[PDB]
Amino acid sequence: GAMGMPKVLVLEDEPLIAMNLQYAFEDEGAEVVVAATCEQALKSLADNPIDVAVLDVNLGPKSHCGPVADALKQRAIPFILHTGDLDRHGELLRKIDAPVMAKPADTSDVAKRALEMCGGDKEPA
SS (H, E, C) the chain: CCCCCCEEEEECCCHHHHHHHHHHHHHHCCEEEEECCHHHHHHHHHHCCCCEEEECCCCCCCCCCCHHHHHHHHHCCCEEECCCCCHHHHHHHHHHCCCECCCCCCHHHHHHHHHHCCCCCCCCC
Specify whether the CB–CB gap between 93 and 65 falls below 8 A: no
Q: Which amino acid, 117?
A: M
Q: What is the CATH number of domain 1-125?
A: 3.40.50.2300
Tell me the C-alpha distance between 69 and 112, whole Å: 19
Q: Which of 96, 68, 88, 61 is nearest to 11 (CA)?
A: 68
Question: Structural domain boundaries of the chain?
Answer: 1-125
